[PDB]
Amino acid sequence: NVMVDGVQLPPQDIGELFGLKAGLVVQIDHVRMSTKFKLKRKMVYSFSLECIMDVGEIQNKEVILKVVAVDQSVSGSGGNHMLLDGVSVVASLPLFTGQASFDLAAMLIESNLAGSNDNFLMRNVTLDLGGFSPELSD
Numbered sequence: 001n002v003m004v005d006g007v008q009l010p011p012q013d014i015g016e017l018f019g020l021k022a023g024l025v026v027q028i029d030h031v032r033m034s035t036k037f038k039l040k041r042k043m044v045y046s047f048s049l050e051c052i053m054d055v056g057e058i059q060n061k062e063v064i065l066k067v068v069a070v071d072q073s074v075s076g077s078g079g080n081h082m083l084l085d086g087v088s089v090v091a092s093l094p095l096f097t098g099q100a101s102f103d104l105a106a107m108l109i110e111s112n113l114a115g116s117n118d119n120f121l122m123r124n125v126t127l128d129l130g131g132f133s134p135e136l137s138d
Contacts, residue, residue: 001030004113014115018106021123024061028068031055031127035090039082047078049086055129064126072134080138087135096127 007017036050052073058066072090074083094101104124110116 001027008112008114011113011115011117014110014113014117015119017109017113017115018119018121026059026061029057029059029065031057036076037086039078039086041079041082045079047076047082049074049076049078049083051075051086051090055127057127060125064124065128067128067130070129070132072132074134074137083137084135087137091131091133091135096129097131100126102126 007020011017031053033053033055034050035053036048039047039049041047052075054071054073055067056069056071058068060066072087074087078086091097096102102124104122106118106122110118
């Protein structure tokens with residue numbers, strides 16, 4: 001729902017972006033992830049598997065976040081056992097299911113919204129994904 005390209009270049013600011021994030025305009029949120037790993041094997045072999053995640057969540061007022069639906073799509077070079085282990089660990093990781101190990105620190109937004117300044121308020125978030133089982137490749 002592209003509206004950030006119009007507010008990415010004016011910072012050259014980030015404080016205005018934080019103030020904008022501070023009626024309510026709390027709409028849905030779209031998360032994109034490309035998590036690449038190098039799952040190896042016991043025998044002499046190797047594999048590189050990356051998973052793309054498109055998450056349809058709901059923005060939160062102040063606390064963490066709110067999620068509606070998720071979606072997963074694996075890819076890369078890897079055997080059946082490699083992708084099986086990867087889809088097993090990505091569903092049972094310290095990620096969103098649990099403490100979510102979310103390092104927000106106003107850093108990912110600073111990469112998306114290009115900026116080199118901070119406003120002393122990180123306002124970290126935490127995903128609450130449902131727990132779907134996208135393990136239908138095998």
